[PDB]
Structure formats: C-alpha cells, structure tokens
Design a protein around this ligand. Structure first.
Ligand SMILES: CCCCCCCCCC(=O)OC[C@H](COP(=O)([O-])OCCN)OC(=O)CCCCCCCCC
Ligand SMILES: CCCCCCCCCC(=O)OC[C@H](COP(=O)([O-])OCCN)OC(=O)CCCCCCCCC
Lengths: 620, 620
C-alpha cells in the first residue's frame, strides 16, 4: 500500500491539473487557487473526480490539505470548499472517502481529529462533514500487522486519542451532533472501542477509565433514556463482556466495581451499604455476571477467554464470593461424582485383574457389563461436553486436558469391550491401557481440596513445552548412535537391531547403561569410544536442559497457583451447574432484587462483606 | 620509558645549560632567561639541538614549559619563542617533536590541548604551530597496555577531550585552520577517532554522540561539498562500518537512525514519512548497509565483528526488517537445502546399515557412489566457505562450529570411500563415524523455526568452557585411583589393566559402579577403602561443579536467545545470498531510489512501519 502522506514520493496515477493543486494545498497559500474554479467550470469537472485524486487510494485534495496542517491551520481548506460548492458538485468534498482496501472509508474529518486540530474539525463540521463516516480499511482493522484500530467513527477516534474538546464539540455541535449509540462495522460503540484499545499498563488503563467514565457521564445527559452499557456488538458482547473476553483486567475491574456518589449514582454497579471500623458491606450489580443468564461474564471468562490472566479475573469481587457460594452449594455433588468414578475404577481394576486365559464367571460377565455401561455413560457425557463447547473447542482443552483424557478412556473402554465380543486377542492391551488412563484420570478430583488442588497447579509448569524441544535433540542423538552401533557391531573378531541398541542407549539415562569392553567384537575400541562419546554428549545435553529449565522457572515471581486453582474450581462449578447429559438442572438465580434508586432502579444485587484493617487504618 | 613529566626524577642525558633552562621554565619566571640568547649566539647553538633536550625522548624546553602551566598560563613561553626566533633556528621550536618510540610525534600543541589551556593553544598557533602534527608513538596507539588513543592529530585530541572552544579555534583560526579531513597513521579521521574512544556506557556515549553531531554540523559549514562520513581509513571502513566492527552499539544506533529537522536535514539517515496515532512510518538510508554492496554493515557484523553484542546490533532498525524480508525471500531455499541434506543422510543410513561381511549389490554400489558424490559436494562447499572467510577465519567458527563439523563429516566420508577402494577394514569405523557426524549435523537446521531455533540457543551456554576445566581435575582423580587399583590388585590372597580400572571407576558416575568386598584379593580392605575414598571425592567434586555452574548461570539476566537466533538467521541469510559454489547468484538491491532533498539528494531508502502505543501515549 502507498503511504498516507509522503514528502518524498509523489501520489500514484493508477490549466489546473492535479500536481499543481496538490502542491498548492501542500504549501498552504490560498491565492494560488485562482483559475481552478474557472478551469473546472470550463471542463465541467469536479474536485471529487478520479482525475484530481490519487489513483490507488482515491485520496482527494482536501485530505491532502488536512494532512499538511501548519500549526493546526491550513489556509487552503475554506477556499477549496468554496470552489467545490461553486462547481456544482453533487458529491460534497468533505464527505469524500478513500476507496482502496487499506484505507477504505478514510475521510478528512478523521485526519483533522488525528492531527488534534479543533479549528479544522469545527471548519469541516460547519461545512457539512458527516460525523458518522466509518474508516473501515485494513489499516483501521485490528490485527497483528501495521494497523490502528480505534473503532471506525470520528467520535471513537476522538475518544481513543484523548481529545476532550473534540469529543465535546462532536457530541453537541448545532450542525450535526455525533451519537454515542453509533456503531462501527463490528457493532462496536465508543465504549467497546475504549475496551478494545485498553491495555493493562497503568497509564493506558487510567486513560481508558477516564475516557469511559466521562463518556458515560455525558451519556447520562445527552441520552438519559439510553442504556449505553447494554448495547451489544455483532458478537453479542456488552463492554463488560468484551472486557471479560479480551482479558482487559483493569477496565473489567473498574466497570465491575464502579461506584458513584450523589449525581451519576444510577451509573454505579457497586453500592456501599454500611461500614463499621474495618468492615465494609456493599451491594454488587449481578446483571450480565450471574451464570443463570446465557452468555454471562463467568461463562465467558471460563470458556471463551484466551488471555493468560483468566485466573486473575475470578478472584475479583463480586466474582470470588459468588463462585465461593456456588462451590459450597455444589461440593457434595462434586464428591459424589468422585465416589462414582472411584467405584467404577475399582470394578475396572477387579475385572482387569481377573481376566482368563487366551459363580465367578457370572460375576466377571456382570463386571464386564458394568464396565461397558460406564464407558458408554462417560463417552456420552464427554461427547455432550464437546458438543456444548463447539465453537470455542480450541479454548476448551488448553486448560482442560482431562476432558480429552476422559473421552479417550471411554473410547478405549468401548473399543476393548467391542473387541472382546469379536474374540480377538487385542482387546486385552486396549483394556489394560484404558485401565491405565482411568487410574490417571482419578487425579482430576484433587482440585476439590485446597491442599492437593493448589499443589497440582504448582507441580505442572513450562517443563512440558521444553520437554518436547529437548526430546527433538535427544532422539537425533539416540537414533544416530543407535544406527552407528548396529552397523559397527555386525562384524566379530550386543547390538543386533535398532530397537535393541536404542534400548541399551536409553538405559544410560536411567542409571542402567552397560559400559564394557566387548572383546568378541572386531571393532571393540571404536564401539567403546562411540559409547563414551554418546555418554558424554548426553550428560552435557541433560545438564544444559536442567540449567536452562532452572533459569526460566526460578525467578522469585509471586505464586499464582491459588488463583489458578480457583479458576479450576470455577470451571468445575460452571460445568456442574448444567447437571448431567441425561438430567438438566434448572438454574438458580443468585442475589436479591433490590431498588437502588431511580433510573424505579431495581437490580439483582449481591451482598459482599469485606474486612480490611490496613485500608481502614490509612484513613484514620 | 621515562615519564612525560616528573617532579622527582631529572630528565635523562642518553653559561646557560639544559638544567638551568629547564628549572627556569619549570618555575615560570621569564626574567631568568636573560643571557640565554647571547650564549646561544656565542656558541652558535639552538634550543632544538640535542644538548638542550632530554636524551631519551627529545623533549625540548618548550614542552617542559607547557607541561608546567600554572593556572593555564606559563610566562616563559613567549620569551622562549622570541629567543628561538632571534637565534636563527631553521627548525621552529613550536614544531619540534619527541623522537623516542613511546612518545613519537608528541608536540607542545598536544600538551597545551590536553592541559585545557586555550590561551596557550592560541599563543602556540599564533607563532606558527603546525596543527597537523601526528603523535604516533606507542603511548598514543591503541593496545591493552598503558596508552591513550585519541587519534593522533590535535583536532582529534581536542574533540576526544570534550573541548568545544579549542575545536572551534582550531577549525577556523586565521593563522592555520585544522582540517576535518585530516587522517592519522591508520587513516582515521576525527569521526573515526570518536568511534574509537566510544564506550557503551551512557556518559561516554552521550559525549561521543554530542561531539560527533557537532563536528558533522560544523563540517556542513566549513567543508559543505565534502562527505565526512564517506571517508574510509586504511582498513576501508567508514565511521559507521568502524562502529559496526568494534561493537560500539550506542554510536552505531545513533548514526544508523540519525534524524534532523530544518537545517542539517541532509545529514539525516532517517526520514519520517507520515504518522497516524501510534503508527510511525520512516525512510532509512541503506547506503553502506545493504548486503548488495561489498563489505557492508551486515557482512561486517556477521563475519568481521568480534564483540559479544553482535546479536544486539541485528535487532536494530532498519537492520531487523531488512533481514526479515531477506529471510522471507530465502526460507524456501533454506528448507530445500534441509530436504537435500535429509535425503543424503537417509541414503547414508541405508547404505551404512546394509554393509556386507568383511539387484541389491548394484543398488548398494549406486548408494556408495551417491554417498561419495555428496561428500565431494559438501567438501567443496565447505572449502569454498573457508576460502571466502579467509582473513577472518578465527571469527568465522567462534559461533559457527557447524561449518567445521560439516567439513569434517565430508572429509570423513571421502576418506572412508577412498579406504573402501583400497579394501582395508578401517573404512567401516570411518563410515560409521561420518554417519554419526552427519546425523548430528542435522541439528543445524533447527534454526529455521523460532521454536526450535530459540531453544537451541537457550540450551547451550558457558557449561562447555567449565566442562573442560572440571575434566582436568576429574581425569587426574581417575588416573591416580586407576593406577593405584591396578598396582594394589596384582597380589592374590578385577583390575588387570589401566583401561579396565579406568572404566570401572568411570562406571560410578553413570550409576553402575561396582562396590564389593573383593575377598580373593590380598589387600581387599585397602582396595575397598580406596574405592570408597574415590567415590566420596568424586561425589564432592561433582556437587562442587554443579553448585558452581548453578552460581554463574542462574542470575535473572534477561533472555537474549531471541537476538542470538536472529543473528544465526542473519548469518544463514548472508551465506544463502551468495548462492552455491557451482552457481553464484546475482545480488538483488533492496529499497527504492528516492530524492530526499538537496545536497538532488537521491538515496536508496528502506520504508519501515513502526507501531508503539506507549511512546505515542507519552506525548499526549
Ligand atoms: C442414565 C441414567 C442412570 C444414571 C446413573 C447415575 C450416574 C451418576 C453420574 C455421576 O455421579 O457421575 C460420575 C462420573 C462423572 O464424572 P464428572 O462429570 O464429574 O467428570 C467428568 C470429567 N470432568 O461418571 C462416572 O464415574 C461414570 C458412571 C459409572 C459408574 C457409576 C457407579 C455408581 C455407584 C453408586
Ligand atoms: C554440481 C551440480 C549439481 C548440483 C545438484 C543439486 C545440489 C543442491 C544443493 C543443496 O540443496 O544443498 C544442500 C546441502 C547444502 O547445505 P547448506 O549449504 O545449506 O549447509 C551447509 C552447512 N551450513 O548439501 C547437501 O545436503 C549435499 C548435496 C547432496 C545430496 C543431494 C540430494 C538431492 C535430492 C533432490
């Protein structure tokens, strides 16, 4: 794509001509525009015609004038608009937009706002600039390349660039006021766009929070009957749900715990009830948060968010206490499920232990029937889970590999019981491997306790992703030395096959490597030197991997295992609330309906008791 | 060498004599010089004669006067010059220089500049001091001993000591102005000398950058038609190339990304094109940087620089994006080379696996021919590489040991195929060892991916240089206890040879050491005590080496593996751009020719798109 503006490269082409006009509006001298209007009238042409624009983009002379503002003012703008009006152009020059795929919908008002020229914005608005044109090119979309997403609207651009005067002028100018309800091509409003450009750094979060609160307070004046935070985009997300999905923890916490006093009190989501010393009791708005409603904040955080700080969101209030009462309500069902799986696995172990050769027989047949029925039940449950987690399936197993393991165990159980009916001998390794998987699957339920559940998070770490990368080097070492030892030992004056030599070389890592002078071999010295070289290289490699893993993991970073265990409990709770595949529970709504003021402002509120001695001592 | 000045040691000798004159010019009283001119006229002698100088160095009385400045002024200087003029000396005393090998070319103007006496500099220049005398002794060269390299010229001395007034006076005095184009004995100009004295500390870098920019701006006035940064020294290096070779990262980054506005705009190498929010688009000068030109900055960084921060240079713009587009253009050739090596190694493994005893036979002969041809091809390619990397060969394999390994593998392959024609049995261990090396050489191509290529940098570290130092102690332990166990076990009431006992003692480190009461030996108690002592000493040594290696490597230093992987990709790209030994590619020039102003200032410019949200938010 060509540059937006370039002092060194002339515009593409893919008497008053285009080059003279562009040079005049670049210099900014209005008196050199004389004769342009007469030339346009003589040739019956307009400034919006393709001959007077950049060929590749459709960038006009007015955008060239705004792109060359000197101290916020270009004197060629108003005479250019006067010439455009006097030429009888049915398409206004202020509303002309670029046509290329990279800068599609880009207009001069966007350039005037981005150049922070309030005078130019006023001059464009006074002459009929549409304040709802959407810059929807690839440069203005959100992706990993060179781009600037701010929404697509001029008001969203003015908000995302921290321009209070431009926002105030656009919202209530008498010519054409901008609407806070206006949406971009994705359905995003200005609050959605502020959530989009939000980062978790303190300065960006402060800017986004200030802009969000100010725009909400002005929406309380300009459109008081409009719920600005209840507007959903094309994904069905509100700004709170969008902040939950994108991992924008700071603005999510600010919206979730928002409190105002006096005026703008209906804009609050947190309402202080009473205080007594270090005890503070508050009411929290549960709208769009409680899992009783479809597509809630909790469901989005658990199953739709990809961000690494999902575990930091679930420990914020009121989410923490709400998930705590849900877990206290469902802990008996959790341990009943654990007891059922223990019974199933015990019968599995008894049946697999007493297999026959390739009253007791009837009991073994009954146990085989029970194993088949339990495998069918688990298979149907896992298939229902993966059907419900349809669209976000890649997000489903990135932290829930036990779902994959349970599905695989049930599939192996059903396959082994099918192969037993066909009387093939391969049912027994399948049954044994499903028994292995079933006993490994019992470690899912360690998350029911704090002591085991936190520890199961502390043990597993980034070792798994580096194990494969070390294994890539180690397998090359193993295969090369194995084929070498097989080739060299074929002549007599140990290593008969590739698998045997590979096993003997793998024995060195477990402390059982045989290292001897193979006197019956012809090349025994070279074989011994190859073994010693392999041992030294493998030990150097193992020391390298240990020290490298030691460098990334020991860094004194504070322990986040408690919040990850809380996130695991939240996922378990939200799955347990749906019931079973054969019996669906009716959802129970949390909180109480309370009137908190006048919009009667009746909301479902959750009461949270907080004790904080240091915070209370700081205000004395 | 004697001291430059010493209040305690008298000058060497290797009526108005030398001692009285030296004491007078040390005290600084001009009225005690009476009778010196008459004595010199009577004896027909001059102050520059060997009788009036230090014997070992040739240091004169004027240098003695300047070395004893009191508050920047010595009153004996002007009468001494008057006596020198009145004596009819054909050699001026101001231009007399020291003659010893340590202080060769040292003059009084250098001492006046180093003493920061602008009055003395003006006094010397007004009386005819040559401002282009070069201090070229061993003290003024650059080496690891006691030295001060500043260039060799008075202007370079004034610049390297941060003396703006002295530089300004030397550049435009009406008596004899110094030239910015003047070069030292190495061809270094003042900008080269500033690059030479540059350090990567912030204060030294700030001083060097300020001096460099000021001298370039004054060269824009004094010699506007002279390209000061295009001057090459005797090594053919410009100041940018010299900064790239010496690892001077700060001044290299400053020169590479230099930008000026308004006046001194032709001195810029970076030209901002357009900005829109956090997006900044700039043009970068590619002169002497692009690898299309011989001896470029990229080639110097990859193959000529010895400094440890080579990987920090390649991640700077515009080098990072340029190397990225080069890699995107050559990645298919990289993986085609990988596929060819995989095919060659697979045929190697198949041929080595199916060797006979010391249609299938014809296929094995064809495979032997293919192995021989591939070995010849790889040998010729590696020989061509080491021929092209002729002068800097020691810099070539300090980070590219795979070149050595590929050459050794090809040599072993050719030697094994030669020995097979001679029908000796030793071809088979050579073939097996070349197979080992060829399978190890496949790990070169892990750098083609980020995931494997970064990890291959993270695993290897300083363990290799400490492994040899630990091995020096461990081999002494092993040999001493081995000869002990062989000597002690010779008498009966296990260890028959040195190699056997060494292997049994090495078995303890791999977890297979045999530790038993050798009841058939006569000295079984002493043998058991020797084994226990060896085990304890070896385990203490291993624990020491593990903890010592743990101390140097775990230090929370930020990971530089990504930049080292980028440097490896840069080396691969620059080698792939030359083509093959049998087919040399034509170089493709990067960037576009654009006019950036008036010197028409036409440069080859590279467009770089940068997104930086925090930097843009800081200016709002
Ligand atoms: C169809 C109508 C008949 C229903 C019969 C009652 C079924 C109870 C189901 C139950 O408790 O589930 C236990 C377990 C499910 O694991 P999970 O979803 O918690 O975790 C899933 C992975 N996250 O599932 C199992 O362990 C398999 C059940 C088979 C053994 C039953 C033994 C009963 C002993 C009293
Ligand atoms: C003389 C005219 C005939 C030329 C025939 C084509 C040769 C292709 C060369 C090639 O792709 O090089 C692969 C490799 C070189 O390694 P490198 O320089 O990337 O890395 C070097 C170390 N850094 O070299 C090899 O692997 C050896 C080539 C022998 C096997 C060819 C198999 C072909 C299968 C299609």
């Amino acid at each position: 794509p060509p540059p937006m503006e370039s002092p060194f490269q002339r515009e593409d082409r893919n008497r008053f001509d285009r080059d003279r006009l562009f040079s005049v509006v670049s210099r900014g001298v209005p008196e050199e525009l004389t004769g342009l209007l007469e030339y346009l009238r003589w040739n019956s042409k307009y400034l919006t015609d393709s001959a007077y624009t950049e060929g590749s983009t459709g960038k006009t002379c007015l955008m060239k004038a705004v792109l060359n503002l000197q101290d916020g003012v270009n004197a060629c703008i108003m005479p250019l608009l006067q010439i455009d009006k006097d030429s009888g152009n049915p398409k206004l020059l202020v509303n002309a937009q670029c046509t290329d795929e990279f800068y599609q919908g880009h207009s001069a008002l966007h350039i005037a706002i981005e150049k922070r020229s309030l005078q130019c914005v006023k001059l464009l608005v006074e002459n009929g600039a549409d304040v709802h044109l959407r810059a929807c090119g690839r440069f203005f979309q959100k992706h990993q390349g060179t781009c600037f997403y701010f929404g697509e609207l001029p008001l969203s651009l003015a908000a995302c660039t921290k321009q209070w005067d431009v926002v105030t002028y656009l919202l209530e100018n008498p010519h054409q006021p901008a609407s806070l309800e206006a949406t971009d091509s994705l359905g995003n409003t200005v609050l959605h766009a502020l959530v989009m450009i939000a980062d978790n750094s303190p300065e960006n979060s402060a800017l986004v929070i200030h802009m969000y609160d100010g725009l909400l307070q002005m929406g309380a004046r300009l459109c008081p009957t409009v719920q600005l935070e209840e507007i959903s985009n094309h994904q069905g997300l509100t700004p709170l749900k969008l902040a939950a999905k994108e991992g924008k923890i700071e603005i999510f916490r600010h919206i979730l715990q928002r409190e105002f006093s006096g005026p703008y009190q209906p804009l609050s989501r947190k309402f202080t009830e009473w205080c007594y010393g270090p005890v503070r009791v508050s009411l929290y708005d549960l709208s769009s948060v409680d899992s009783w409603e479809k597509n809630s904040v909790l469901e989005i955080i658990a199953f739709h968010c990809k961000s690494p700080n999902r575990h930091r969101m679930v420990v914020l209030e009121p989410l923490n206490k709400l998930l705590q009462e849900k877990w206290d309500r469902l802990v008996s069902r959790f341990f009943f499920n654990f007891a059922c799986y223990l019974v199933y696995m015990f019968i599995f172990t008894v049946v697999a232990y007493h297999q026959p050769s390739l009253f007791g027989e009837s009991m073994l047949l009954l146990g085989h029937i029970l194993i088949l029925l339990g495998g069918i039940y688990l298979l149907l449950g896992q298939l229902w889970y993966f059907w419900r987690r349809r669209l976000f399936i890649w997000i489903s197993f990135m932290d829930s590999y036990f779902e994959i393991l349970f599905l695989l165990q049930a599939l192996l159980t059903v396959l082994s019981q099918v192969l037993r009916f066909m009387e093939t001998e391969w049912y027994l390794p399948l049954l044994v491997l499903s028994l292995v998987l079933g006993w490994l699957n019992l470690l899912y339920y360690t998350r029911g306790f704090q002591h085991t559940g936190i520890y199961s998070v502390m043990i597993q770490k980034v070792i798994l992703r580096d194990l494969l990368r070390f294994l890539l080097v180690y397998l090359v070492f193993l295969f090369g030395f194995a084929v070498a030892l097989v080739s060299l030992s074929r002549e007599a004056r140990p290593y008969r096959s590739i698998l045997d030599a590979s096993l003997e070389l793998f024995k060195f890592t477990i402390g059982m490597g045989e290292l001897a002078f193979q006197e019956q071999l012809r090349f025994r010295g070279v074989v011994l030197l190859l073994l010693l070289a392999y041992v030294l290289l493998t030990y150097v490699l193992l020391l390298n991997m240990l020290i490298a893993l030691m460098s990334e993991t020991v860094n004194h970073v504070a322990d986040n295992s408690w919040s990850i265990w809380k996130l695991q409990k939240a996922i378990s709770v939200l799955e347990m609330e749906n019931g079973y595949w054969w019996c669906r529970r009716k959802k129970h709504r949390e909180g109480r309906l309370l009137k908190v003021g006048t919009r009667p402002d009746e909301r479902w509120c959750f009461r949270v008791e907080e004790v904080n001695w240091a915070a209370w001592e700081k205000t004395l």
